[PDB]
Write a protein that holds these residues in place. Sequence first.
Motif, mmCIF file in Angstrom:
data_model
loop_
_atom_site.group_PDB
_atom_site.id
_atom_site.type_symbol
_atom_site.label_atom_id
_atom_site.label_comp_id
_atom_site.label_asym_id
_atom_site.label_seq_id
_atom_site.Cartn_x
_atom_site.Cartn_y
_atom_site.Cartn_z
ATOM 1 N N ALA A 118 7.303 15.968 9.330
ATOM 2 C CA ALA A 118 5.918 16.151 9.836
ATOM 3 C C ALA A 118 4.933 15.973 8.674
ATOM 4 O O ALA A 118 3.898 15.320 8.860
ATOM 5 C CB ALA A 118 5.777 17.505 10.480
ATOM 6 N N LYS A 119 5.276 16.524 7.504
ATOM 7 C CA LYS A 119 4.441 16.513 6.279
ATOM 8 C C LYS A 119 4.663 15.200 5.509
ATOM 9 O O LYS A 119 3.924 14.921 4.515
ATOM 10 C CB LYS A 119 4.809 17.746 5.457
ATOM 11 C CG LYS A 119 3.640 18.439 4.776
ATOM 12 C CD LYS A 119 3.648 19.937 4.971
ATOM 13 C CE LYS A 119 4.838 20.627 4.341
ATOM 14 N NZ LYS A 119 4.717 22.102 4.457
ATOM 15 N N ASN A 120 5.687 14.455 5.925
ATOM 16 C CA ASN A 120 6.101 13.150 5.349
ATOM 17 C C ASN A 120 6.365 13.353 3.857
ATOM 18 O O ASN A 120 5.837 12.578 3.070
ATOM 19 C CB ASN A 120 5.043 12.072 5.567
ATOM 20 C CG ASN A 120 5.667 10.709 5.733
ATOM 21 O OD1 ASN A 120 6.675 10.560 6.430
ATOM 22 N ND2 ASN A 120 5.049 9.704 5.133
ATOM 23 N N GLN B 53 0.848 -1.226 0.000
ATOM 24 C CA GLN B 53 0.000 0.000 0.000
ATOM 25 C C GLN B 53 0.872 1.260 0.000
ATOM 26 O O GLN B 53 0.284 2.344 -0.001
ATOM 27 C CB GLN B 53 -0.943 0.034 1.205
ATOM 28 C CG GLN B 53 -0.250 0.296 2.546
ATOM 29 C CD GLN B 53 -1.164 0.064 3.728
ATOM 30 O OE1 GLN B 53 -2.388 0.037 3.606
ATOM 31 N NE2 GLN B 53 -0.568 -0.121 4.891
ATOM 32 N N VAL B 54 2.201 1.138 -0.012
ATOM 33 C CA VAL B 54 3.105 2.328 -0.032
ATOM 34 C C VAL B 54 2.852 3.108 -1.327
ATOM 35 O O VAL B 54 2.846 2.494 -2.395
ATOM 36 C CB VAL B 54 4.587 1.937 0.132
ATOM 37 C CG1 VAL B 54 5.531 2.991 -0.421
ATOM 38 C CG2 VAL B 54 4.912 1.641 1.587
ATOM 39 N N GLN B 55 2.637 4.418 -1.224
ATOM 40 C CA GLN B 55 2.501 5.317 -2.389
ATOM 41 C C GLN B 55 3.535 6.425 -2.248
ATOM 42 O O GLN B 55 3.602 7.053 -1.185
ATOM 43 C CB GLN B 55 1.097 5.903 -2.492
ATOM 44 C CG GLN B 55 0.034 4.863 -2.809
ATOM 45 C CD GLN B 55 -1.345 5.477 -2.829
ATOM 46 O OE1 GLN B 55 -2.262 4.973 -3.480
ATOM 47 N NE2 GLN B 55 -1.504 6.572 -2.098
ATOM 48 N N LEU B 56 4.256 6.568 -3.298
ATOM 49 C CA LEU B 56 5.105 7.773 -3.383
ATOM 50 C C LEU B 56 4.529 8.624 -4.521
ATOM 51 O O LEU B 56 4.492 8.138 -5.657
ATOM 52 C CB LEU B 56 6.528 7.291 -3.669
ATOM 53 C CG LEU B 56 7.228 6.456 -2.594
ATOM 54 C CD1 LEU B 56 8.567 5.911 -3.029
ATOM 55 C CD2 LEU B 56 7.358 7.223 -1.288
ATOM 56 N N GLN B 57 4.195 9.869 -4.241
ATOM 57 C CA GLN B 57 3.531 10.698 -5.265
ATOM 58 C C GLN B 57 4.372 11.926 -5.576
ATOM 59 O O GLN B 57 4.471 12.801 -4.718
ATOM 60 C CB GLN B 57 2.145 11.119 -4.793
ATOM 61 C CG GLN B 57 1.351 11.854 -5.859
ATOM 62 C CD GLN B 57 -0.072 12.112 -5.432
ATOM 63 O OE1 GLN B 57 -0.519 11.672 -4.375
ATOM 64 N NE2 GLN B 57 -0.799 12.844 -6.259
ATOM 65 N N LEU C 154 10.507 20.000 -6.772
ATOM 66 C CA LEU C 154 9.655 18.786 -6.866
ATOM 67 C C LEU C 154 9.220 18.392 -5.454
ATOM 68 O O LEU C 154 10.037 18.569 -4.483
ATOM 69 C CB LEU C 154 10.440 17.635 -7.509
ATOM 70 C CG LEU C 154 10.877 17.795 -8.968
ATOM 71 C CD1 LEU C 154 11.764 16.676 -9.472
ATOM 72 C CD2 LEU C 154 9.685 18.027 -9.871
ATOM 73 N N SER C 155 8.141 17.708 -5.291
ATOM 74 C CA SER C 155 7.619 17.134 -4.028
ATOM 75 C C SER C 155 7.353 15.649 -4.240
ATOM 76 O O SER C 155 6.948 15.252 -5.345
ATOM 77 C CB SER C 155 6.372 17.858 -3.549
ATOM 78 O OG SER C 155 6.640 19.217 -3.286
ATOM 79 N N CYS C 156 7.615 14.856 -3.207
ATOM 80 C CA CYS C 156 7.285 13.414 -3.155
ATOM 81 C C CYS C 156 6.572 13.151 -1.829
ATOM 82 O O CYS C 156 7.253 13.133 -0.785
ATOM 83 C CB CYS C 156 8.551 12.593 -3.312
ATOM 84 S SG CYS C 156 8.315 10.826 -3.002
ATOM 85 N N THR C 157 5.247 13.047 -1.872
ATOM 86 C CA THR C 157 4.372 12.818 -0.698
ATOM 87 C C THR C 157 4.231 11.307 -0.516
ATOM 88 O O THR C 157 3.651 10.673 -1.419
ATOM 89 C CB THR C 157 3.012 13.496 -0.892
ATOM 90 O OG1 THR C 157 3.249 14.844 -1.305
ATOM 91 C CG2 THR C 157 2.168 13.465 0.366
ATOM 92 N N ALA C 158 4.733 10.767 0.602
ATOM 93 C CA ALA C 158 4.758 9.322 0.922
ATOM 94 C C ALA C 158 3.558 8.950 1.800
ATOM 95 O O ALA C 158 3.194 9.729 2.704
ATOM 96 C CB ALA C 158 6.065 8.946 1.598
ATOM 97 N N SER C 159 3.002 7.775 1.530
ATOM 98 C CA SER C 159 1.855 7.141 2.217
ATOM 99 C C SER C 159 2.263 5.697 2.491
ATOM 100 O O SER C 159 2.845 5.108 1.563
ATOM 101 C CB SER C 159 0.610 7.180 1.353
ATOM 102 O OG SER C 159 0.298 8.501 0.951
ATOM 103 N N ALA D 69 12.245 4.996 -2.204
ATOM 104 C CA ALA D 69 12.459 4.797 -0.759
ATOM 105 C C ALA D 69 13.012 3.391 -0.538
ATOM 106 O O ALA D 69 12.654 2.484 -1.323
ATOM 107 C CB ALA D 69 11.168 5.008 -0.037
ATOM 108 N N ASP D 70 13.822 3.228 0.507
ATOM 109 C CA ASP D 70 14.374 1.923 0.928
ATOM 110 C C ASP D 70 14.341 1.793 2.450
ATOM 111 O O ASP D 70 14.879 2.687 3.137
ATOM 112 C CB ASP D 70 15.791 1.717 0.416
ATOM 113 C CG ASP D 70 16.169 0.241 0.439
ATOM 114 O OD1 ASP D 70 15.657 -0.500 -0.425
ATOM 115 O OD2 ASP D 70 16.928 -0.158 1.357
#
Length: 124
Positions: free
Chosen positions: A75-77, A1-5, A20-25, A98-99
């Motif tokens: 904080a914003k991940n 379910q990991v999302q990197l956007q 650039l931004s990479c928002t992780a879930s 990510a690793d």
Amino acid sequence: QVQLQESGGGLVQAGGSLKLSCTASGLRVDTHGMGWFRQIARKKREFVASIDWEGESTNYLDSVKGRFIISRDDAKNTLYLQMNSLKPEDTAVYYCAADRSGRIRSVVSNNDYWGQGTQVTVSS
């Protein structure tokens, strides 16, 4: 379910800047190695920048050192890439990765997770 956007890509003139931004879930940016890669050509996805879990140790591709700055807001991940002094040769799809090891691997496919990418195009 990991999302990197990835987001923040676009069309920019040579000498311009983009962030650039990479928002992780489904993961924390402070427990992973986080990085940026770019598909600069058909047969080549190259390392651009990384920041290790502790958020102190960073690495850059020689060709972007002094132009690009990797950062992260725990904080914003979110992972960031400040791109300055952009030139036509920077034109590519940019991918975040990510690793779980806490440090980015040299090749995208040796990392646990990578995103769908964002297009950065640099004109004259």
